[PDB]
C-alpha cells in the first residue's frame, strides 16, 4: 500500500511539473508573441498606441 501511494504522489507531481514547465511555458510564449504582433500591427496603422 505504501509503495502504491507513493507512485500516485509521483504521478501527480510529474503531471503538475509537465503542466508548469512544459505546457504553460509554451502557451505563454505563444500568447506573448501574438499580443506583440498585434500591438505592432495596429500601432503602424494608427500612428499611436
Amino acid at each position: 500500500k505504501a509503495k502504491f501511494e507513493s507512485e500516485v504522489l509521483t504521478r501527480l507531481r510529474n503531471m503538475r511539473h509537465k503542466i508548469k514547465r512544459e505546457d504553460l511555458v509554451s502557451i505563454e510564449k505563444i500568447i506573448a508573441d501574438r499580443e506583440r504582433e498585434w500591438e505592432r500591427k495596429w500601432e503602424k496603422i494608427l500612428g499611436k498606441c
Binding site: 500500500k1 505504501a2 501511494e5 507513493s6
Partner: protein, 46 residues
C-alpha cells in the same frame, strides 16, 4: 542475606516470568513488531 540465596529467590520469580512471557507472546509477535516503521511511512505519503 547471602547473595547465593538471593539469586536463588530471584530465579524462582524469573521462572514465573519466563512462563508468563511464553504464554502471552503470539507466534507472530516478532513480525508485528517490525511493521511499525512501515505504517508511519504510509501516513506521511498520504
Amino acid at each position: 542475606g547471602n547473595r547465593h540465596r538471593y539469586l536463588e529467590e530471584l530465579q524462582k520469580h524469573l521462572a514465573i516470568t519466563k512462563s508468563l512471557l511464553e504464554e502471552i507472546m503470539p507466534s507472530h509477535a516478532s513480525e508485528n513488531a517490525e511493521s511499525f516503521d512501515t505504517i508511519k511511512d504510509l501516513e506521511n505519503i498520504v
